[PDB]
């Protein structure tokens, strides 16, 4: 019997199924790009989803149901999430670097100007401003959700979290519409490349963040969170703020300054 406070995890198949799902998704993308087939990729996406579901399911079992999340374990998870967010910031930094490199020194092929000749940027005061207000608003509503939870208020936590998720969905739908309406495409040189790859990865993170918030919503419905112990919620909130801040940088850099 242990006399430390740390979690010895039961032997698990999910690391192997996750690793195999990575092989399947990557070889699948290769198959799709080069051999006109989506078969491997769909299997990889499926096993990835199954892996994530069961892995995080087990973490909930280990914590809410089995009590393995002592303060020391929780503190480790805090560090883990912070470090993960840092790695994600650096990932985006690569794309911002690409954007500034290309826009600060526009080549002759572009007309030697930014935006390039033949590019008609979106008006940053229209849907992009709306998107900005939406994500900023969701940062306020999630903060309300956090305080309600700490104050032991089930109903207001749920209402605030629902509002936050609704705003995430609104952003995603607005962005999808904007993508469809945009007169430029990913193939429209480095303008289209930077625009769609940077905002596209951001959009993926909004979807990931929204999914995480939805997980928290259902766990809250099931009474998993105490007024003092709710790291899953805190992690989702930190990630949500990260998604907001990345948007603010994208808005200022690509939509506004780069218009």
């Amino acid at each position: 019997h242990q006399t430390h406070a740390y979690h010895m995890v039961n032997p698990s198949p999910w690391p192997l199924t996750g690793a195999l799902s990575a092989l399947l998704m990557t070889s699948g993308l290769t198959m799709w790009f080069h051999f006109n087939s989506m078969t491997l990729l769909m299997i990889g996406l499926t096993t990835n989803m199954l892996t994530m579901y069961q892995w995080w399911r087990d973490v909930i079992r280990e914590s809410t149901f089995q009590g393995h999340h002592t303060p020391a374990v929780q503190k480790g998870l805090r560090y883990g999430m912070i470090l993960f967010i840092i790695s994600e910031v650096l990932f985006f930094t690569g794309f911002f670097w690409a954007f500034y490199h290309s826009s600060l020194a526009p080549t002759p092929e572009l007309g030697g100007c930014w935006p390039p000749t033949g590019i008609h940027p979106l008006n940053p005061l229209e849907v992009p401003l709306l998107n900005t207000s939406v994500l900023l608003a969701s940062g306020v509503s999630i903060t309300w959700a956090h305080h309600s939870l700490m104050e032991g208020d089930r109903k207001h936590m749920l209402q605030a979290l629902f509002i936050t998720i609704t705003l995430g969905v609104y952003f995603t739908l607005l962005q999808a519409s904007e993508y469809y309406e945009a007169p430029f495409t990913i193939s429209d040189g480095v303008y289209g490349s930077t625009f769609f790859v940077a905002t596209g990865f951001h959009g993926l993170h909004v979807i990931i963040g929204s999914t995480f918030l939805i997980v928290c919503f259902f766990r809250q419905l099931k009474f998993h969170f105490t007024s003092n112990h709710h790291f899953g919620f805190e992690a989702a909130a930190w990630y949500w703020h990260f998604v907001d801040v990345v948007w603010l940088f994208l808005y200022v850099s690509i939509y506004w300054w780069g218009s």
Partner: peptide, 20 residues
């Protein structure tokens, strides 16, 4: 007014509860 959120005292279990 509204409550409805369990406390650690009410709901903590296993090793977490022992430590608390």
């Amino acid at each position: 007014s509204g409550g409805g959120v369990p406390t650690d005292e009410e709901q903590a279990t296993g090793l977490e509860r022992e430590v608390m």
